[PDB]
């Protein structure tokens, strides 16, 4: 067959898109307790009853959480059981034998979800599939209770019967392709822009100022983001696994919290710096010797190091629940789990304290402007646009992540994992935007003009 190409059309890839890999017991659309990939633990309303059924199926005390290895085996046990039920049942097998392999998955998909006896209930609909009345059965199936409870999944199945193609499922794969090239472009902009900013200030003596020294610390944190944090995050998400061992992912996690904390705090430092330099240019200039601007950045990185490496390498961030323990003991799993104390403590230091200081700073900059020795002119509006981009971009990139992060602490299961990852990557791209915001100055544009060889 020689088909090792991506999205082979088959039942296994069909159901995984529909059900999804969840390693903890969860309640499905109907309300029943489900684990793994659509594995129905029990029809009982007691989580305790579902656990013992799970423990009987697995053979150990799962505590409600199974490994990815075990979840795969239940799925295959569930798929083959659905295949056996079709071959055993007298209504399904005549329909099943007369179906091409693509529409066989759609029938097995139904039997997977609703069972042998439940799917055999479609007296007219199954009879239409024998007679190859696809569109006519498609309209028939859309009227079922199965359609009302899960309209989205039924559409994919009903369309799959109707066309005999994987059009309902093949489109999902473009997402992984488009996500990869988007994740790719993000790495380029962060590495290119930040190296370009670092190189300009270091090579050109005109740019070696105090405010730019703060820019340099910002550019270094954003650089390591694009070099270290972001590339492995793309590799982690696309391949669905971690391939570098436990130690390196805590060390990767350690760099992630390190750079983001240092980057955001430096934005806060730059904000206050410009407040002082704009509202008291002369007193401020007396203050900052080269040693202070050096010790300030030192504090930012010491504070950032204490938030990132010290809790993570000392296992203080470690969560205590069973699903965290397994991912901690699994070499290939590096999902992010933390106790409530670290999540709150890190969020305040990394984001909330800088946010409050930043918001207050630019407010007073805009507040100081009106009480000066002086009629709705342009540059006052033009200046207000500039800070709106600065604070607006910072806010819109990171405020969803750390709100959702804190919301995840207060109430569990409210944040699905995809939203949590998406917003972090929307936070990741602030590193690419920071050179575009803070390096608009005339001396930068000249330095970039010569660094790019005109």
């Amino acid at each position, epitope marked *: 067959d020689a088909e090792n190409l991506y999205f082979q059309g088959n039942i296994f890839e069909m159901l995984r898109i529909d059900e999804g890999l969840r390693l903890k017991i969860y309640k499905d659309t109907e309300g029943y307790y489900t684990i793994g990939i659509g594995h129905l633990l029990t029809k009982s309303p007691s989580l305790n009853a579902a656990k013992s059924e799970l423990d009987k199926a697995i053979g150990r005390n799962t505590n409600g959480v199974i490994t990815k290895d075990e979840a795969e085996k239940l799925f295959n046990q569930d798929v083959d059981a659905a295949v056996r039920g079709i071959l055993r049942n007298a209504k399904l097998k005549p329909v099943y034998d007369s179906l091409d392999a693509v529409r066989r998955a759609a029938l097995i998909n139904m039997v997977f979800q609703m069972g042998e006896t439940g799917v055999a209930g479609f007296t007219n609909s199954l009879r239409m599939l024998q007679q190859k009345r696809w569109d006519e059965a498609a309209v028939n199936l859309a009227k079922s209770r199965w359609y009302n409870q899960t309209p989205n999944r039924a559409k994919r199945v009903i369309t799959t019967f109707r066309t005999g193609t994987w059009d309902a499922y093949a489109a999902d794969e473009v997402w992984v392709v488009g996500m990869g090239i988007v994740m790719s472009l993000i790495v380029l902009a962060i590495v290119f822009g930040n190296v370009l900013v670092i190189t300009a200030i270091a090579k050109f003596e005109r740019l070696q100022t105090v405010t730019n020294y703060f820019i340099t610390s910002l550019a270094c944190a954003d650089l390591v983001m694009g070099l270290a944090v972001v590339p492995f995050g793309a590799a982690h998400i696309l391949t669905k696994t971690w391939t570098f061992g436990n130690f390196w992912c805590e060390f990767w996690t350690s760099i992630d919290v390190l750079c983001v904390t240092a980057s955001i705090e430096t934005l806060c430092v730059i904000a206050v710096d410009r407040y002082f330099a704009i509202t008291s240019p*002369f007193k401020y200039q007396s203050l900052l010797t080269k040693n202070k601007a050096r010790v300030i950045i030192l504090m930012v990185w010491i504070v950032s190091g204490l938030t990132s490496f010290l809790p993570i390498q000392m296992h203080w961030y470690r969560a205590t629940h069973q699903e965290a323990i397994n991912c901690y003991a699994e070499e290939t799993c590096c999902d992010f789990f933390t106790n409530q104390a670290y999540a709150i403590a890190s969020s305040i230091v990394s984001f909330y304290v800088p946010l409050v200081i930043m918001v207050f700073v630019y407010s007073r900059v805009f507040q100081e402007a009106k009480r000066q020795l002086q009629k709705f002119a342009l*540059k006052e509006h033009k200046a207000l646009k500039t*800070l709106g981009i*600065i604070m607006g971009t910072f806010t819109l990139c990171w405020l969803p992540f750390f709100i959702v992060n804190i919301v995840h602490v207060i109430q569990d299961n409210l944040i699905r994992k995809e939203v949590y990852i998406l917003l972090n990557w929307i936070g990741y791209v602030n590193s690419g935007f920071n050179p575009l915001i803070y390096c608009r*100055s005339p001396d930068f544009r000249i330095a970039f003009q010569e660094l790019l060889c005109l």
Partner: nanobody
Amino acid sequence: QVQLQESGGGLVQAGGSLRLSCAASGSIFALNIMGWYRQAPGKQRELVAAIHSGGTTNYANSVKGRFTISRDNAANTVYLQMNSLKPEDTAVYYCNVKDFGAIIYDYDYWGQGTQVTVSS
């Protein structure tokens, strides 16, 4: 789109007094610095006297106690009062405007230029 109009360039004897006046046109952000820079022959441009929009000033050490900077109350006009002029004070005084409209970087405006001559 902004203008700087420099006035008061003078020939004067040593110890005499000069007054330099700068006026600005267009639209300038409220948070700004207007100052005076001089460049001596074969020397680098240096700060002489500066005033912030809020009234805070700054003077070079060589001109402290001798030069006084003042500002118009509402017309973006700056006056440099130079007294006890020394022959070392012989340079060309440039009207400056430091502009904070773009928050991250200060953006300068420069004046035309006026000659000050002190005769020993």
